[PDB]
């Protein structure tokens, strides 16, 4: 009885199969990760477009068909990193995990979802090039060798007065600097640079304050940030976990209450009840992983890390 046609896409694979009508989110998730051979599953989730066309995370503790998925066939899901580590070097152990994060993060940088200044864009492109092409080779890598590739954000190409040959030269010089680097180490170096970007690993929600002024909430691995409507880079106010006594939710309102009782409460509003609920859930998830990564590695993790440096 496998009567529900699904398509799950990762950053570089497409899976098409059928599920039973009683299949839970977890069961669907488990089949995907088994198929692709991913073990570092804690970072990941399945995203779908609801009936209004909003991106939504599948809840793994509910049946698939009981959730606001659309009425198309096949049902369409994206398997994506949902939670980001505090440090890629310490926490992305296996090559597959590193690759999935690399491709997702790179897509966001090239699509201008994650802001990157031009110099960082160039350095990131140089590592992407090392990973794709291996060592720079003057014999082979003639002028124009990068001409096909999408290597920089359009904003960086729009806003500036270099041409595309001049952009290739910008990247080429750094490509040549990485000579001898293993392609996988280039992917790790990419992620090391990207994880320091202001927008990296931040989930933004449109909110208002108690006077009705528009702001953003960001939720990330370390806590919550409040941003000016016109600036998603520099937080107006930061709330690391350690400074939060509780968050009190009431319909569309959430109130951040400090540990410091001699500090004030901060009141904001989500545009919809469903969104406020999503804010809580993503806060709870992030905070759990925050606690977990500070505990000693599980046996499974200790073995994966051993298996990984065995492979050198």
């Amino acid at each position: 009885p496998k009567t529900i046609s699904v398509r799950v896409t990762t950053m570089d694979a497409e899976l098409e199969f059928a599920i039973q009508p009683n299949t839970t989110g977890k069961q669907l998730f488990d089949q995907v990760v088994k198929t692709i051979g991913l073990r570092e599953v804690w970072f990941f989730g399945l995203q779908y477009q609801d009936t209004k066309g909003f991106s939504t995370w599948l809840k793994l503790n509910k049946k698939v068909t009981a959730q606001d998925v659309r009425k198309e066939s096949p049902l369409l899901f994206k398997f994506r990193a949902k939670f980001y580590p505090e440090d890629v070097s310490e926490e992305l152990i296996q090559d597959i995990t590193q690759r999935l994060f690399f491709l997702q993060v790179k897509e966001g940088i090239l699509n201008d979802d994650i802001y990157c200044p031009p110099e960082t864009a160039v350095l990131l492109a140089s590592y992407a090039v090392q990973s794709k092409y291996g060592d720079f080779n003057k014999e082979v890598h003639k002028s124009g060798y990068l001409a096909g590739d999408k290597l920089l954000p359009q904003r960086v190409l729009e806003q500036h007065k270099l041409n595309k040959d001049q952009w290739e030269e910008r990247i080429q010089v750094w490509h040549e600097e990485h000579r001898g680097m293993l392609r996988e180490d280039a992917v790790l170096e990419y992620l090391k640079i990207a994880q320091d970007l202001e927008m990296y690993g931040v989930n933004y929600f449109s909110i208002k304050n108690k006077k009705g002024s528009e702001l953003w909430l960001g939720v990330d691995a370390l806590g919550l940030n409040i941003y000016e409507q016109n600036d998603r880079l520099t937080p107006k106010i930061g709330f690391p976990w350690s400074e939060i006594r509780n968050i009190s939710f009431n319909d569309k309102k959430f109130v951040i209450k400090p540990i410091d009782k001699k500090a004030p409460d901060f009141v904001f509003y989500a545009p919809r009840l469903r969104i406020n609920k999503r804010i809580l859930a993503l806060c709870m998830g992030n905070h759990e992983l925050y606690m977990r990564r500070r505990k000693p590695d599980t046996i499974e993790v200790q073995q994966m890390k051993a298996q990984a440096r065995e492979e050198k």
Binding site: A13, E16, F17
Partner: peptide
């Protein structure tokens, strides 16, 4: 990669 239950 592509896997299909065809």
């Amino acid at each position: 990669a592509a896997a299909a239950a065809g």
